[PDB]
Structures are given as structure tokens and as C-alpha cells.
């Protein structure tokens, strides 16, 4: 790994760097960092690694065996734009020093093991992923977790709830997108035009080529189109994207979130994921079996759809995730594919040149660990082509129709409604994850215990204010 | 309603100077509803034919095209309402289906008679005695908010640990507060509800109910009153009266009550500890010597209740809030076994267990249940047990909350369902023991299923929860 | 037990009783009650007992064996003066239904087993105890227990801290006893004259013959002299005394406490305990061996003093108890006896007629379970006479002298400084408690685990605001 | 090394703070910890029980005086414990004879005063100082913490 290290050390020298910020992702998806004063960096310190206390992350180490190592990966490093004093961020891998192998519970380690398992099978060479991370910019967020009171309230000057409020001595400027009305009125109704625009500039600042930037449907919502990248690199840029959006929100006095569903009755945030598999410069998704796609591509899709009910445990990894999977908000609840259809789980976009052929999986949200989600999808798509899995027939209707009857009488599987059912299904069908030990069963078992306690057990056990409207008078 | 009983009812009114008759009836959800008639405008015929009303207003009941239905008054356990300013007598009613010319198959109180009459017809028993303990809470304040950008609740009580620091009337704080989980049973002034609880049972008796015990309960503003056992309908009837009496007495003294299963995170939930015995020809069929004072008949009853338990939860634990209570360690059952003297078990064999008193106590039900449907269903599940001689398995005399997630799955130990959605699924996939003799007609079951998914599940599965903001907001 | 029951039922009939309030004391000393609607009482219900859930009291039952029985003792019952609707209070004993014997972890059961163990040995017939329960009447008490903040503040219109305050639109009436000045200025400096006086009336109302009532030394403090009674009956009236004082404080809008030390730099509350042993109408404490006392009495004292360091675990049962055992506040820290000396652990009062001969043990406080304290003292005094234990020589000096030197060079044992040392000493010397199974070792082990978790472990683990004055700047 | 009573609010199980006096590699439940790297140039121990309420001079001085006693008297540190030390019971503590940290500064000063010789070697800690240090810590920290009421006693005991 000492190729890079000279050069990286030379990149620090001419950017006048005082801190190297080692960043690495725990199971939950949280980005974590630890800064080393540059002068105290030797070349040897980057072969050995960075020690740390990996017992502090649920699902990783117990205290008896607490010591671990970060292995810096010297790719996509960049100068932190925000830190007062010069800092370079470097992604890192967690190395298990008790097995002297990459940590089978390191999410980014799994993501490398999956993009290698595709190299290793011969099916494909590269697996390209392309994320649209919808997010929200609120002014204020207030929470209460207690014996006698549960409470939240986001706030945004754009919200329908402020149409009558007094702001600056009682001045209210009107011009508010309605409920679900943000797509895409011009300013001053759009108050985030310069906020979204500066985000994009800083995204470019850290090595993210950008495409589109717009308001989204919900009241305070936004999106930036970022360029397809390979599986890890795609997930690497998701970590970056979120950091930038959250921090620029913060500089301008606001607060961002990529959480799936913050507002009732308004659109959730999606991680619209775009995939294609290529080999020897030929895009394997392109064909003529169906609307510009190959049968290979449809077998991939056959596998994603087949395991989807369990795949959701990694793509929809929060209980809040399922508050979004409700019909009528351009969020899929039914697992089928269709061209130009946003009620569908999967979407075939319009363009579909032999170069851009792909699917868009609309069901994941940004609550997921990007590493695990991308990884898990590819393991589900590869199982499909191995077993040449039938994806069923396209459904080109508005899927939010005939809910109760047509679903049970004729229709196909739909997304699990709670995180718990997603985990049940996951544990009941885990082989397509376990081949070639991409997802070792100890990791899979670590994630199940972590997610039940962090997400399910609190949600199943803290009362919800709506039960008080319903039941208080019971 | 025999005119021997209509006459004397009219005389009860003249000599108590009754000016309004408050016909009360229970929709599917458990809400007690009323419609008052100016006395004197009451016919003898209106107590036979019945009282018209608009049954399209009740979800799970009639459409607007066939909206008209009838209230059929039952002239038993009526009572003068103490609260109403002008004298009113409350009288129970069932819905009569005028399109099918049968007692309304979706009227819960009608179900509760059809469920108790299916037993006398089968010969297994004469009476089925039920005795509910409805733990409740008396709060000072409840504040709620459902909106696009804010979900919010707040109960408040003078006894709450959250008030240890508050400034009251002139910033004076009396101290003396039970801890979280400490209300059982400190004496006053730590116990603030001694005169409130005492005033409740005074009014319970006013309305034809007999009380034995009254204490503070384990959670901070919690309380309980023991009422006499009753037959299946009559017990469910007294539950409706009891709920009304505490709610209204909490109210006259400036407070607000609830029987909801889990209002406070981290403190005990409220249970409807339900006690059953089946008697026939004045012998108690639950007492025997097969086990700790219980008969083969009773143990087969318990096996039937335990077999259908996960599906039965849909009528006994009929809100999602029920399932915030069914968490280990608050004397709430998550494990479906029986044991004497055990409050970790789903069923409990009390210590006394004489002949006349032999009985079970089911600890998993709560007051979010419709008492008619709950009692009706509990009896229909026990009778399946006696018909099919169902073994309830083996008692577990351990601390059930100490068992691991390994010890749960590996040892194949049938636990309670975690959500109402799974409970309805479990019910819908096991509905036959209720459909015996059309006690729970299928139209009703589909209505009840449709009601609970739209009222409770789909809103709880779809409205954001403030803890997701602690967990996920930073993603 | 059916003698009483007819009559008791007849007493309820003519007092127009609607509730019978069964009261019983857990280990901690807390009085607990459970009310039965009178009409629902059968005679048989008083032989059998009252079932209850004895798993709700730490130190008693685990949930697997939760059911227990209360056995009403139909003595000293009385009409509750405060309850809106007529209530009779009845003390109760806890019956263990798994061993079909009185509950070896019932404090009042232990107190009966001890006053019987003295019958059984022949040393004495009656053991008379006489409590002075000092207490405080504050207007307001505010507390905060949290991650970032620990907080208390009592309030009383008499406190030095209110000399400058505005009360009723800015009116302050002056006339405040100073720090340590309450003994015994006349009103209006004494603001509790009618509060103390009405307490006494209600104490008589419940069958407690009273003697003296005065302000005490500390600013909001008080005391009522109540008549000697036998060991249980003495402890029975302590439960009563506290209930009345707390409830009359409450009716008049205040809040009482018998807690040992609520105010820093002011007097704590004592449970000045007066004991004598009698046999065949002759007071065994009276003699001529020392200042009107018998050698038998001095052997008793020899035993109390010998085991005192461990005896403190039952008489000084709260960590707050030891905040009082500080020199200079008429609280003993040194374990010796003396006539007319209030710096001493034990005091021989002035009167000492052959009828009133006794000791006054000043070191207990009202934080104790009265049952256990009285019980434990007698087991320590009886061990003394068995072994004819030497109590040492009297110390007639002001004991709050030559602290560091004279204590270590010449002086005798002093009280343990923390609750933990009191428990260590208790566990290291428990035989005088265990004879005749008065204190079974399972009870003794129950009390140790309960008291470490309720009292020691929280105190040793929640930071104290003074550490912030000392150490914040470390 | 733990020279305030506030030190002992930290020495409670489960916050990566030692209550058990043993060593182990990669173990943050232990009083002493052997780090993973442990090259030649880097071989070392890490003592996790000290805090910054300590006077660094006295703390370091005393740590060195206690280790040197170990080399002089060839003291065996016993056996390493490669368990989760915070999982051990109160039974497993006493029955298995496992030397835990002192719970209060008062017991720590008692333990020091009853074992002061390894510091007095070559007059490094003269006895006048030790008695001064003992007198200082009892009057500054112990006697005030043992004598000033604590708000939790108000939750526990106020209702008595």
C-alpha cells in the first residue's frame, strides 16, 4: 500500500495539512472520524494501521477484545472544506487483529468482498451504482424521549404550518409550496436555491462530479444527481454526499436529514439506486429481450425481486423506513417493475441507450448503510443470474389501485410493512448473501441483534402519541 | 323484553323522578354510546320495538344506504346516573338487525349473549363467571399533537418523577413521590388518590356494582378496584359502567382518567386481569384434583385458551398500545404458560384456590379490548379446549422474564405476538373456534379485521414516531 | 384470632366504616396500605388473610413465587382521621405461604420474634421502648436526579435563607430563629405552634398518649413526646406518629420529613430511643451499681456498645444518616455513655427513679425501619447480659474535643462514618442477631443486597455538587 | 492517582472504567491493559484507573515507586483475566478472591496509610508529607462529601 503513501504524503505537504481525519463506517451507517496531527505521521503508521477501541460500536467488539486497527485506504481522500484548520479525510477499513483478516463485520469490508465476488464468478467486471439521495432542510428540530412524553417537531419556513406565523417582529412573506408542492416552483417560493447550489459546489470540492439539482416534491426537500460509480466508490460518495449536505445546512444555520419520512402526509426521502453490470466495456444490461434490456439484466432483476422482502432489512434499515413505504407518495409498496412508472418498485428509465441501460430501484432509503445496501443488492442480483430467476411480468398500471382485493386475489409480493418482518424474511433466506463469505453468518447475526435492539424493540415499546388520540378514552 | 319487566321499570322511574332515559350501547371498538329520551315521551312500545338510530356512523357497522337500525333496550342492571344534573336512568341496549330480522351479528353485546348461550346449549356448563381487574390511571393533564410536522404527547401528574423539581401553586413542591414503579403501595401523602379511589367505589356501588379491594397500583398514577365476578355479559357490562364511573369521577374533581395499556414508558402498564370459572348445576367444574386444585375440565379449557392465544390477542389486546405493555419485566406476560403464584406467566393460578374459588387468571388482556368481544372470545377458546381435550402443556415455575432470546427460540416456547398486525394475522388464520354456532359470524370478523387495520395499524405503521428522530435523523 | 374479629367488626359498625385499610411495613420502613370495601368483609377473610403481590418490595419475593398473605393483627386499629370516607387502619403481618410460617423477611415479624426471644430466655418479661422522633416541616421541596444535574432545595419561611425574600407582594415579617436557634423562642418567631399542637391532638385521636411538644434546635424542626410502649407497640406507634405528622403537614399545605439531615450546618433529626427491661413489675434497669442503674442494665449497655458499629446498619439505615453523625450538633459520633451528656452516644437521663431507670440511645435516626432498629438493639443488649459485657468507663467530658489525637491515642470505638462500613461490620458480626432465628441469615442477606443497591451504590455513583466546587478546576 | 471522591463515581462497572485489578491484552475492563501493537521499542503497560483529579507529580512519582518495589521484591502480578470483567457477579467477586479497586477515597487513604513503606524508600515521600497529604484529603474531600447532604438522599429518605 506504499505506492499511494509517498504521493498522499506529498498531497498533504502542498495543501498545508495539519490533520488527517480517518473515517470509517460502523454497521449502523454512521460516519466516524479520528484526527491525527499530521507532523506525528510516519510512513510506517499507514502500513500498521490506526488502533482504536472497536468495542464502542454495537454489533462489533466486546470489551475483552477491544483493540482493533483502521487500515487507511488511500483513495478519494480530500481536504475537508469546513474544518477551520486544514484536514484531509481518508476512508479506512477495519482490520480484525484476532483473525488477521479484514473484519467480517466491517460494512465497507463486505462491500469490497462483494465487488470482488463478481470479479470471481465471471458474470461481470464492474458493478456500477448511482444514488439520488433525497433529503430535507429544516430550520429546527425538537425531540422529547421520556416516561411521560414522546415528542417531535421539525420546522422549516416553507411548511404549511407556518402560513400564519410571526417571524421577524410579525413579518410573514407568504409564497409557500403547498403540501407536496415543491416540484419545482421558482423562488421565492423555493427558498433553498442558493442552499442547494452551494452544496453542489462543495460536492465538487471533494471530488464528486454532479449533474442535476432540484427541489423535490415535499416541502423542504432536495436532491443532487451524482455520477455513477463502482459499488464501493458509489457508497463512498454517499458517505461524502451526506456529510456535505448536513454540514452546509449547518453553516447556514439549518439542519439536514436524509431520514426516510420526517413529515406525515408528505413525500419521504428516497435513495433511488441506479445499477448496471458491465464486462469488457460492453454494458451487460442492454439487450433486446425487453425495452432495451438484456435477459441477463432481467434475471438480475428476477433475483432482486425474489429476495426483496428480505433484502429490505439492509435497504430499509429503520422503522421510519416503513413509514415511507405507504402507497400514494411515489414510494413503492408492490414488488414489480415497469417502464416510466413511479408506483412500481423498480423503474426502467426512459433513455436506455446501450450505454445507459440500467434499473432504478426506488424502494431503498438513505437510512440504510450504503455499503450493506449496495452489497446486498448485488448478491441478490447475482443469485438471479445464477438461477436465471424469472422477474415476472411488467405491471404498467397505477399500482396504487384496487388495494385489498387485487393484491390478495391476483397480485405479487409486496414490501414488508415493518422492520421486524423484513428481518424475519432476511433470516429465513440468507444463502444468496452467504456465498463466498461476503456476508458471514456472524455478521448477519450481529446485524439482527443490533437492529432489533436499536430499531424494533424501542419502537415496539415506546408509546406513540396517536394511541392517545385513539385509546386514551378506551 | 317481557312486560313484567317493562312495567316495573316504568315505576322505578316515576318514584325516582326520572326525566331522561339514557339508552347506552357499545360499538365494536368498545366505546359506550348514548341517546337520551325525554321521559314521558317514552312508550311501552318503544321498549319492545326499540329505538331507531343511525348505524352508518360506526365503522365496521352499516352503510348509509341501509343506515337505519334499532336499539333494543335490556332492562337489567339499569341505574340512575349520578353525574347528570337532571335525573337520568341509564339502560343497556343491543342492536337489532332489521334487514335480517336477527339480533345484530356485529353487535358486540349481542355476540356476548350468543357466546354465553352457545355454552348452555352444548351442555358443558350452565354459567361462565368472569371477573375483571381494570387497572387505570388518573392524570392531571394530557396533551396531544398529530400533524404533518409534529407528533407529540404528554401526560402529567403531580406524582410523576418528572415533577420532582417543578414549581407549583407558588413554587411549592410537596415532595413525597413514589418512584417510577413505586406506587404499590405507599401510604399517603405519597398516595394522593386515596380519596379519589374511595370516591370511585362509592359511585361504583351507586350503579349496582360490588367492590372488594381498592389500592394504589405499581405505576405512578395507577389504581385498581376489584369488582364482583359476573356472568359473561354482566361482567362485560360492569366493565362499561366502571370505566364510565372512574372517567367521570376523575373528571368531577378536575382530572382525566384512562384505561389505556401503556401511557408511560418505563413504568407498569395497565392490565385487565381476567378471572374465569365455568360452573354447571352449581358445581365448579374448574376445581378438581388433576393439578393444584383444578380439574381436567379446567386444564383442557386452559389448553384451548393457550392454543388459540396468539389469535385471541386480537380481541383481548385490540390496540397497538396493548403491545407496548407486552414487554418483559413489568409483570406483563410475554410467555404463554401457566404457574401458581407467578406474575411472569400468561395465565396464573392464584394461591387460595378453594373449591368454590377454583379459577384461572389471564394476565395478558387489557382494557383497550371490547369486554364483550374479549369475554365472548375467551369463552369460545376455552370451550374448544374442552371439546378437543387440549393439553395445556407443562407449567413453567421460573422467572419467565429471565429467559434468553436463545432460551426462547431453542426451547420452543410459544410467546405472545408482538404487534396487533401479527395478532390479526394469527386470528385470521385460526378463526374456526369462534365461528362455532355462528357466534362470531364471518361478516363480523372481516369487519373487525377491517376496523382494526384502518383504526390502529395503518396509522401507527405510517405516522412517524419521535424516537425515529433520535435514531435516524442523523443519517 | 376470632376473639377480636367479632368485636372489631362491631367497632366498624358503630364508626360507620366503609374501608378497612390494611397496613404493613416493608424492609425499607415504608408504610403500605390496601383498602377493602367494608361490606365485602367476611369473618373468614380475617383468618385466611389478605392476598397481595409481595414481589413489588425489594428484598422480599421474586415474581415466580409472588403471592403472599397479610395477616391482620387486630390491635391498635383506629379510624383514619384524614380520609374523606370512613376508614379503619389495621396493622398486618406478612405470612409466608411457601413455608407456612410468619415471613422471616417481615420486619414486624422479626419484632415479634425478638420480644418473644426475651420471654423465652427468662432475662426479662417486657422490653419497653420510647421514641422521640425529631422531624422538619418545610413549605416546599424540589429535587433533580439526572445525567447533567443533581439538585435539592428545601424551603421554610423560617430559614435564614429567606430573611430578604419577598413573599406576599413583597412583605417579609422578620422574626426568624437563627441557624440552630429554634429552641425554644416564642411565636411569632415560632411559626409552628398551632401546627405542632394540632398534630398532638390527632396523635391522641389514633391512640397515642402524648407528653411534651416543642420546637427543636434546627430552624424548622419539631418533636412530640409519646409514651413508652413494648417493642412492637413502640414501633407500631412510630409508624403512626410519622403518618400523622406527614399528613397534617400536608393538610396545612406543607411537607414533613423525619429524614436524618436535610439542612447542612443545622441539627439533624434524632430517634432518641428510651429503653428499660422489666420483670415481674420490678424495673431491671434500676440498681445502685452506677447512678441509679443495675449492673444488669450496664451489661445490656455493654452489649449495645460492643456491637454498635454493626448495629448502626439497622439504626442508621440511610447514607443521609451519617451526614448527621458529625460532631458539634448534639449528634453522637463516639460510642460511650454519660449522665446528662448529649455529646455521648448513650445518655443516662436525670430522673432515674427505680421506676423510670433507662438509657437514651441518641445515635439512631428515623430513617431506620423502627421494627428492625428496636429489635436489633434488644438482641445486642441481650448478648450483653449473656456475656455480662463490660461497657467501659463513663466519659463525662465534652466529647467533641481533641479529635485527631485523643481518639487514636486513648479513645474507644466511634460510629461508622458511611453506611457501607456499617454493613461490613454488620456482616462481620451477626450471631447476636441470629440466635433463636430472630434474624434469619436469608433476611440478613436480603437486607444487605437491598441496602447496598438502594443507598450505597447510588450514593457512591451519583456525583455530588460539592465535587464541582472542589474538582471542576482540577 | 484517584485523589478525589469524584474519582470513585467513575470507578463503577460498565463505562470502560476499572473496578477489577488485573491485566489483559486488548481489555478495557481491566485495571491494566496491554496494548495490541507491543513492539520492542513500544512495549509498555497502560494503567486505566488513574484520573486527572490526581496531582500528576505525586501520581507519577507514586506509580514508579510501586513498580520499583515490584522489581526489588520480584512480585508476581498473578494471572491475567481475559474475560468481560464487568460481567462478574458479587458472588464471583468475593468467592473467587479477586482484588477490586477501593470504593471510596476514605478506604484508599486507609489502604495507603496502612501500606506506606514502598513510598518512603530513600525519603522520596517523607512521612511529614504523607501525614500532610492525609490531612489535606480528609479535610478537603472526604469530610465535606461525608457531611453535605446529597439530593438523592432526598429521593430515598425524604418520605421516611
Residue numbers in the entry:
A (entry chain A), C (entry chain A): 8 to 481
B (entry chain B): 7 to 481
D (entry chain B): 322 to 481
Task: Quote what the paper states about this structure.
Six subunits in the asymmetric unit of Hpy GSapo were almost identical to each other with root-mean-square deviation (r.m.s.d.) values of 0.22–0.27 Å for 474 Cα atoms in residues 8–481. Superposition of Hpy GSapo and Hpy GSsub gave a r.m.s.d. value of 0.50 Å for 473 Cα residues (residues 9–481), and a r.m.s.d. value of 0.50 Å for 4,742 Cα atoms for dodecamer-dodecamer comparisons. The adenylation loops had higher r.m.s.d. values, which may be attributed to the disorder of the loop. These results indicated that Hpy GS does not undergo a large conformational change upon substrate binding. However, the Glu flap in both the Hpy GSapo and Hpy GSsub structures showed a similar closed conformation with little differences. However, the open form of GS was not found in Hpy GS, and the Glu flap was well ordered with a closed conformation in Hpy GSapo in the absence of substrates. This suggests that Hpy GS could exist in either the open or closed form regardless of the presence of substrates.
GS is an enzyme involved in the biosynthetic reaction producing glutamine from the condensation of glutamate and ammonia. Although the structural and sequence information of Hpy GS indicate its relationship with GS I-β due to the presence of a specific 25-amino acid residues (residues 155–179), the adenylation site (NLYDLP) found in similar homologs is replaced in Hpy GS (NLF407KLT), suggesting a lack of the adenylation regulatory mechanism in Hpy GS.
